[PDB]
Amino acid sequence: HKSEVAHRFKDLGEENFKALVLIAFAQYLQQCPFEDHVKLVNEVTEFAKTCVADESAENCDKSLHTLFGDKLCTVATLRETYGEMADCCAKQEPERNECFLQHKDDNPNLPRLVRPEVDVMCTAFHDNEETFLKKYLYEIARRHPYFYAPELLFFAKRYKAAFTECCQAADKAACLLPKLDELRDEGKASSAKQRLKCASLQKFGERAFKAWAVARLSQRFPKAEFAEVSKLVTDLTKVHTECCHGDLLECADDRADLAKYICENQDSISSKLKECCEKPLLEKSHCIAEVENDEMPADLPSLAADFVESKDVCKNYAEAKDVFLGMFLYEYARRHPDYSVVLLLRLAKTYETTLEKCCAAADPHECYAKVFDEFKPLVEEPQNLIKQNCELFEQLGEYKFQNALLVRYTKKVPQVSTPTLVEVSRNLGKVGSKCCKHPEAKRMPCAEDYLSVVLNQLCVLHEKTPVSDRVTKCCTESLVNRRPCFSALEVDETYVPKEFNAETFTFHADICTLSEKERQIKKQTALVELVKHKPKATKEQLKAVMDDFAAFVEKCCKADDKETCFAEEGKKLVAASQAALG
Ligand SMILES: N=C1C(=O)NC(=O)c2cc(-c3ccccc3)sc21
Ligand SMILES: CCCCCCCCCCCCCC(=O)O
Ligand SMILES: CCCCCCCCCCCCCC(=O)O
Ligand SMILES: CCCCCCCCCCCCCC(=O)O
Ligand SMILES: CCCCCCCC(=O)O
C-alpha cells in the first residue's frame, strides 16, 4: 500500500482508529496523563485524514512503525519520565521499535483504580460520554500494556452498553454494579490468560503448544481433515509466537491473515463460521476464536483400527512420531468436545509412553493391545470430581459451598495466608456455581478454562512469597499435572496447630453495618483462623460452632446495646467453642 495509515483509517473507520491509537500510546507511555494522549490521538487522526485525502501527501508513504516511533519521540518529557526509552529515539528502524518493546513496564507503579459511586459515573457518562469512556480506556490500557488492543476495544463497547442501559433505569446501582463486576472479572481473566499462554510457550516449548492447539482446533473443527487442522496449528503457533513478542501491528497482521484464510476455506473447516466471517475485519479473528464447536461427523469409527489393531502402528509411528501422535490426538479430540484439552493431552502422552515401551519389545501388538484400558481411569477422575463437587454445591449453595472448600483447603495447606485461602476458596466456589449449571457434556471444558486462571493466580501470589513446598510442587509441575497435583493434596498431618489469639475471634457491632460481600469475607476469614487453631475438629463440631456464631451475630446486631453484647456474648461463644473443640 502507498500509504499504510490511509489504508488502516479506511479499514478500521475513524472511531476504531482513534480508540486503537489511544490504546497503543497508553501502553508505551504509561506515566503520561490522559490530556497529553488525547492531543497525540487528535494530531495522528488529523494527519491520517490528509493521507486519506491524498496518498502522495507529505510523510503518508512512511511505515506505521516509522510514524508511531517518530510521534513517540516528539514527547518533550520523554527523557525526564522514561530515561532509558528516550535513548531508543537515537536509533533508526527497525532497532528503535525493538528498543520500545523492551522498555514496556509489565506491572507499572500506578495507584489502584477506584470505582466511583453509581450516580457520579452516570452523571459523568451523560455530561461528557467521549471523555468518560476514553479516560477509563486509557486507565486500563496503561495498567495492561500487553493486552491485545482490539480485544480491549471489544470490552470498551460492552462497557458503553452497560452505562447506556443502566444509567436510564429505575434502580441504577442494581442494574450497573453486577455488569461492571462481570466485565471486570472477564477482563482480568482474559489478561491473565494471554500472559499465561505466552509464559507457557517459553517454559514448556513449541511442541507442547502445538499439541494443545491440535486438541483445541480438532474439538472446534471436527469435520476438518487432519492436514487442514495441522496447517491451522502451524499458522496459530506463529500468530501466538509473534503476539507474545508484543508488536501490536505484527500481531494484528498475522491474526488478520489467519482469519482471512479460515473465512476463504469455511467448507474445509466448519459450518459455524458464516456469522463471524461476515463481521468487520476488526472483529473477525476474535469472533472465530470464540466460535461454537461444529457438529462432529455422524458415523465415525473407533480409533482401535488405526491405533491398536493395525499391524503398521509401530511402522507408522516410527516414520513420523509427532505426526502419528498428532493424528491420534486429532481423532480422539474431535470425538470428545466434552473433554478438557489437558485430559486429551494426558491420553496422547499415555499412548506415546505405551508405544515407546511396546514398539521396542518382543511382541508390540500384544504389548499395546490394552492401551485404551489405561484411558479409563484418566477420563473417570475429572468426571467423578465434577460429579462430587457439583452434588455438594447443589446441597449447600455458593456461600456454604465456599465454606466447605475453605475448611477442606485450610486443612490441606494451613501454611497458606488467610487472605489467599479466602480469595482462592471464594473463586473456586464461583467456578462451581458457573460450571455445575452447564450440562455434563460442557462441564469439563468450563472447569478447565476457569480453574487454569484461579490456579495460576494462586501460583503467582504464592511464588512471589513462598510458604508451602507442596503448592510450589503443583505450581512448577507440567501443565497437564498441575490440576491433578492440587487434587492429590492431602490433609497436613505434620502441621502444629496455630496458637489461640483472643482478638482473632473477637467481633464488634460494625459487622452488622458491613456489606453482604465484606461481611462474608470477615466470617470466612474467621472460619479459616478457626480451622488453623483446631484442624482436628470434626464436621459436627465445626457446624455446631458455625451455628452458634450465626445465632450470636443475629442476637447482638438486633440489640438495644450492640457493643457490650458482642463483648459479653463474644466471650461466652469463644469459651463454649474452646471446650467443644479438640
Ligand atoms: N475495575 C478494574 C480494577 O480494579 N483494576 C483493573 O486492573 C481492571 C482491569 C479491567 C479490565 C476490563 C476490561 C478488559 C481488561 C481489563 S477492569 C479493572
Ligand atoms: C495506527 C494504528 C492502527 C491500529 C492497530 C492495528 C490494527 C489492528 C487490527 C486488528 C484486526 C485484525 C486482526 C484481528 O482480528 O485481531
Ligand atoms: C471445586 C471447583 C469447581 C467445581 C468444578 C469441579 C472441577 C473438577 C476438576 C475438573 C478438571 C478440568 C481440567 C482437568 O482435566 O484437569
Ligand atoms: C475458637 C473460637 C470460635 C469462635 C467462632 C469462630 C468464627 C466462626 C465463623 C463462622 C462463619 C461461617 C458461618 C456463617 O456465616 O453462618
Ligand atoms: C490451597 C488451594 C488449593 C486449590 C485446589 C484446587 C483443586 C481443584 O481444582 O478442584
Curated annotation (Swiss-Prot):
Disulfide bonds join C51-C60, C73-C89, C88-C99, C122-C167, C166-C175, C198-C244, C243-C251, C263-C277, C276-C287, C314-C359, C358-C367, C390-C436, C435-C446, C459-C475, C474-C485, C512-C557, C556-C565. One of its GO terms (biological process) is cellular response to starvation. Changing R112G: In Yanomama-2. One of its GO terms (cellular component) is cytoplasm. Interacts with FCGRT; this interaction regulates ALB homeostasis. Interacts with TASOR. In plasma, occurs in a covalently-linked complex with chromophore-bound alpha-1-microglobulin with molar ratio 1:2 and 1:1; this interaction does not prevent fatty acid binding to ALB. Binds water, Ca(2+), Na(+), K(+), fatty acids, hormones, bilirubin and drugs. Its main function is the regulation of the colloidal osmotic pressure of blood. Major zinc transporter in plasma, typically binds about 80% of all plasma zinc. Major calcium and magnesium transporter in plasma, binds approximately 45% of circulating calcium and magnesium in plasma. Potentially has more than two calcium-binding sites and might additionally bind calcium in a non-specific manner. Belongs to the ALB/AFP/VDB family. It is linked to Hyperthyroxinemia, familial dysalbuminemic: A disorder characterized by abnormally elevated levels of total serum thyroxine (T4) in euthyroid patients. It is due to abnormal serum albumin that binds T4 with enhanced affinity. This is Albumin. It comes from Homo sapiens.
